[PDB]
Amino acid sequence: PIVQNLQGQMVHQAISPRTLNAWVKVVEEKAFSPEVIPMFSALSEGATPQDLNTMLNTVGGHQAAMQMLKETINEEAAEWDRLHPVHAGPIAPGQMREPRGSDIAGTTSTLQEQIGWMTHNPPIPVGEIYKRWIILGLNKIVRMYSP
Amino acid sequence: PIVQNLQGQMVHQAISPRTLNAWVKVVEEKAFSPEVIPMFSALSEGATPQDLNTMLNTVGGHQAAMQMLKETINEEAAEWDRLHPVHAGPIAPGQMREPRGSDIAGTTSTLQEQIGWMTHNPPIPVGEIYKRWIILGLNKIVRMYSP
Amino acid sequence: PIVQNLQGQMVHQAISPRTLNAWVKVVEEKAFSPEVIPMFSALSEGATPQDLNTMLNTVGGHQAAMQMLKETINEEAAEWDRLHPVHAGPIAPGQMREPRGSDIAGTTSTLQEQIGWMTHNPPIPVGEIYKRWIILGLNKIVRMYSP
Amino acid sequence: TSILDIRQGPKEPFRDYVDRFYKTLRAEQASQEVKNWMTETLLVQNANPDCKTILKALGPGATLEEMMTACQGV
Amino acid sequence: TSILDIRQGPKEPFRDYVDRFYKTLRAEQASQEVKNWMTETLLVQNANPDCKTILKALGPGATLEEMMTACQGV
Amino acid sequence: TSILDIRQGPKEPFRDYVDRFYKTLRAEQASQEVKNWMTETLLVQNANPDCKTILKALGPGATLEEMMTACQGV
């Protein structure tokens, strides 16, 4: 995640193993139950896309759901690209590039790039955009997996 | 929560997973027992409304009680709005807006707004107002759930 | 691992026992399962070759696989040496030496040497080169150990 | 399971049923007004005859502690 | 176990089978285009006659929530 | 369970009963004066005849260690 250091700057720090394991354990115990979404939200505080793929990729089991989510993440990403067209002409030397759906999904962007966008002024909340897609896709799952 | 940093200022820091899990475990083990209220009170030290909705939303089970509480929180909030009318004329540029029942419940306010009110001079104790509503609603539950 | 200190420099710090034990426990529980690879990847964040041999050498059990991996690591290392020939003439006093497959495997290099290469400007990602060999060799294992 | 499929047993305490209701209601995502409509309507409708009888005597305007204490002996 | 050896039982819910499929698909390392080909093809082909029948009625263009809700009673 | 429903068994040690009493008293929220009234009154009243007899001999002014040691053999 990207956290604020004592000095008063935003720097990246790694997520903790008993945080990781707590994510694992939630999924083990409460599967598709709604409490998973606030839980997720708390444990995703200050998290990167990269950390969010890590959390999704580290799941075991419920592979039908994991595939449905993936496909929702790509749909929501396809929709990001649709709604926000690429911008006019070449990229400025003085500036950094606008993200695509795949940069938001973490796929085409690097960590330093993910830190550029979030730490820069104005900052862009690429975590929160992926977060809604995850929560939206979580609703899809919850609604389906209701019996 | 909003905690004091080493430098001598009040800054927000996130609540810990084994704190979260300790909240979960209390509820699992002691359900509606009275010891839940001091316990709550200790674990709610320096907590935001936002953190208090997080704690309530992360409950599983006892949904009749969770609904009774919600409805108590809204009643107590409706009562906040009744007792404290909105103030005269437009909001000053030099000042920040007075809270409503829903800002106290965390619903209409943002975190930075919740930090403005609490950290500002004079500070307003929107946590402690929600806390009484929670404790009051906890009494309602305890009294009902006595057999 | 090599981590960034508060002062704003990259310094080496040792890996933690409950990190070590978490590596052990993963292997105990999920053996050759695919979730082992993202898991590995997270726990190998900022890690040295030296730390990566430590992790491989501390395995117990699955010795057929451990030997297959070793032999993959040496093949991938032999391939590093093949693809990247040694450079022209004597090593400059002002400069530090280029790595071989065995320096990447950590074998012929010392820690201070591993810190020179990574911390220096440009930096060389000898962790990430070993990491691919480990992940590649992990694919070999996973594919074989599928039943 | 759908919200319409939530019903009270012939020997099941109302209480255990009301818990099931706001759990399933907890997995419904509809507007609040619709969920209010579901509350006053479906809960009583799928309640058992003995308690159903009881709840009809509370009249309208009733709140959950009073419903929950009203059908306790049933 | 090979991906061709993944098949649906005569009493096995499709759901439990689809889980097995994307687990084994999870251990295949092939190009995405090939894995797309495997998805539309092999899944239905090794599905049981009763659900297979059902899936033929969904036509093409179908997505996983609709397949998964389509073969639920089977 | 209501505080009036708290009573001592015919074979139940007083001690186990007094624990039950201040647990239920712990779920009563009344003014302290009322809770004092409940203490001196209801505790003895729902105490069993054998201990009840014992407690009558302690007279008034008695404190909990002396009541608790007084009904120990009963």
Report, in angstroms and rounded to the nearest whole number, the Rg of chain F calculated over CA atoms.
12
Q: Which of residues 27-56 of D touch A (CB under 8 A)?
A: 27, 29
Answer whether residue F3 is part of any domain: no
Is any Cβ of chain B less than 8 angstroms from the Cβ of D16? Answer: no
Residues of F in contact with B139 (CB under 8 A): 29
Answer whether residue F38 is part of any domain: yes
Q: Which residues contact B86 (CB under 8 A, 6 or more apart)?
A: B98, B100
Residue B99 to residue B86: CA distance in whole angstroms: 9
Answer whether residue F45 is part of any domain: yes
Which domains are seen in chain C, by residue range? 2-145 (1.10.375.10)
Q: Which residues contact C64 (CB under 8 A, 6 or more apart)?
A: none
Residue D73 to residue D13: CA distance in whole angstroms: 9
Residues A100, A81 contacting (CB under 8 angstroms) = yes
The size of the B-D interface in CB pairs under 8 A is: 27
Q: Residue type for E42, please? A: L
CA angle A125, A127, A128 (to 5 degrees): 70
Q: Flag if A60 and C35 touch (Cβ within 8 Å).
A: yes
**Would you put residue A89 in left (φ > 0), alpha (ψ -120 to 50) or beta?**
left
Find, among C47, C40, C36, the residue nearest to C12 by Cα. C47
Q: At E55, which CATH number?
A: 1.10.1200.30
The nearest alpha carbon in chain C to A50 belongs to C42
Answer whether residue F18 is part of any domain: no
Find, among A124, A125, A133, the residue nearest to A76 by Cα. A133
**What's the maximum distance between 2 C-alpha atoms anywhere in chain A?**
55
Answer whether residue F54 is part of any domain: yes
Rounded to the nearest 10 degrees, what angle do helices F14-26 and F32-45 cross at? 150
CA distance A20 to chain B (A): 10
User: Phi first, then psi: what are they for A62, rounded to 5°?
Assistant: 45, 55
**Residue where the block lists tokens 């057999």:** B147
Residue D70 to residue F42: CA distance in whole angstroms: 27
Residue D51 to residue D65: CA distance in whole angstroms: 15
Q: Peptide bond preceding B122: is omega within 30 degrees of 0, i.e. cis?
A: yes
Residues A6, C6 contacting (CB under 8 angstroms) = yes
Q: Residue type for F45, please? A: Q
Residue F55 to residue F51: CA distance in whole angstroms: 6
Residue A70 to residue E25: CA distance in whole angstroms: 14
Q: Which residues contact A52 (CB under 8 A, 6 or more apart)?
A: A44, A106, A127, A130, A131, A134
Rounded to the nearest 10 degrees, what angle do helices A49-57 and C36-43 cross at? 140
**Residue where the block lists tokens 């009888």:** D53
Residues of C in contact with E26 (CB under 8 A): 34
Q: Residue type for F25, please? A: L
Q: Residue type for E74, please? A: V
Q: Flag if A64 and E64 touch (Cβ within 8 Å).
A: yes
Q: Indicate the SS3 state at residue B10.
A: strand
Find, among A110, A105, A128, the residue nearest to A47 by Cα. A128
Residue B143 to residue F27: CA distance in whole angstroms: 7
Give me the half-sphere count of Cα atoms (radius 13 Å) on the Cβ side of residue B6: 4
Exposed e or buried b per residue across E6-41, where buried means at least 16 C-beta atoms within 10 angstroms of its C-beta: bebeeeebbeebbbbbbbbbbbeeeeeeeeeebeee
Q: Which residues contact A14 (CB under 8 A, 6 or more apart)?
A: A1, C42, C45, C46
The nearest alpha carbon in chain B to F23 belongs to B34
Residue B73 to residue B136: CA distance in whole angstroms: 9
Residues A100, A108 contacting (CB under 8 angstroms) = yes
Contact partners for chain D, using 3 or more CB pairs closer than 8 A, are: A, B
Which of F1, F2, F27 shows the shortest C-beta gap to B142? F27
Answer whether residue F56 is part of any domain: yes
Quote the tokens at residue E57: 């009625």
Contact partners for chain A, using 3 or more CB pairs closer than 8 A, are: B, C, D, E
Q: Indicate the SS3 state at residue A93.
A: coil
Contact partners for chain C, using 3 or more CB pairs closer than 8 A, are: A, E
CA distance A9 to chain B (A): 14
CA distance F66 to chain B (A): 28
Could you tell me the residue range of the domain that residue E7 belongs to?
A: 3-70
**Would you put residue C135 in left (φ > 0), alpha (ψ -120 to 50) or beta?**
alpha
Q: Which residues contact F14 (CB under 8 A, 6 or more apart)?
A: F8, F47, F48, F51, F67, F68, F71, F72, F74
Residues B7, B54 contacting (CB under 8 angstroms) = no
**Residue where the block lists tokens 């400025």:** A92
Q: Which residues contact D14 (CB under 8 A, 6 or more apart)?
A: D8, D47, D48, D51, D67, D68, D71, D72, D74
Q: Flag if E19 and A63 touch (Cβ within 8 Å).
A: yes
Chains A and D, touching by 3 or more CB pairs within 8 angstroms? yes
Q: What is the DSSP string of C44-103?
A: TTT--HHHHHHHHHT--S-HHHHHHHHHHHHHHHHHHHHHSPPPSSSPPTTS-PPP-HHH
Residues C124, C48 contacting (CB under 8 angstroms) = no
Residues of E in contact with A68 (CB under 8 A): 64-65
Tell whether the torsion through CA atoms of F55, F60, F63 and F64 is positive or negative: positive
Quote the tokens at residue C142: 């996973």
Residues C68, C140 contacting (CB under 8 angstroms) = yes
Is any Cβ of chain C less than 8 angstroms from the Cβ of E57? Answer: no
Tell me the resolution in Å. 8.2
Residue C123 to residue C105: CA distance in whole angstroms: 17
CA distance C27 to chain A (A): 14
Find, among A115, A94, A128, the residue nearest to C4 by Cα. A115
Quote the tokens at residue C126: 């000898």
Residues A49, A58 contacting (CB under 8 angstroms) = no
Q: Cα dist. F44→B34, B65, F55 in Å?
A: 25, 35, 7
- Cβ-based burial of A56 (10 A; exposed 0-12, middle 13-18, buried ≥19): middle
- Cβ-based burial of D26 (10 A; exposed 0-12, middle 13-18, buried ≥19): middle
Q: Flag if E22 and A71 touch (Cβ within 8 Å).
A: no
Give chain E's domain count: 1
Q: Residue type for B109, please? A: S
Residues of A in contact with B20 (CB under 8 A): 42
Residues D62, D43 contacting (CB under 8 angstroms) = no
The nearest alpha carbon in chain C to E29 belongs to C139
The nearest alpha carbon in chain B to D23 belongs to B63
Which of B63, B66, B68 shows the shortest C-beta gap to D65? B68
CA distance C146 to chain E (A): 6
Residues C96, C117 contacting (CB under 8 angstroms) = yes
Residues of C in contact with E30 (CB under 8 A): none
The nearest alpha carbon in chain B to F2 belongs to B147
Answer whether residue F12 is part of any domain: no
Residue F34 to residue A70: CA distance in whole angstroms: 63
Q: Flag if B143 and F1 touch (Cβ within 8 Å).
A: no
Rounded to the nearest 10 degrees, what angle do helices D32-45 and D14-26 cross at? 150
Q: Residue type for B110, please? A: T
Residue A109 to residue B118: CA distance in whole angstroms: 38
Question: Roughly how many angstroms between the first and final C-alpha of chain A, as a whole number?
Answer: 36
Residues of B in contact with A35 (CB under 8 A): 57-60
Q: Peptide bond preceding A122: is omega within 30 degrees of 0, i.e. cis?
A: yes
Which of A64, A71, A140 shows the shortest C-beta gap to E15? A64
Residues of A in contact with D26 (CB under 8 A): 34
**Entry field: residues in chain C:** 147
The nearest alpha carbon in chain A to D23 belongs to A34
Chain C interface with E: residues with Cβ < 8 Å: 34, 139, 142-143, 146-147
The size of the A-B interface in CB pairs under 8 A is: 25
Residue E11 to residue F5: CA distance in whole angstroms: 55
Q: Residue type for A35, please? A: E
Residues A125, A99 contacting (CB under 8 angstroms) = no
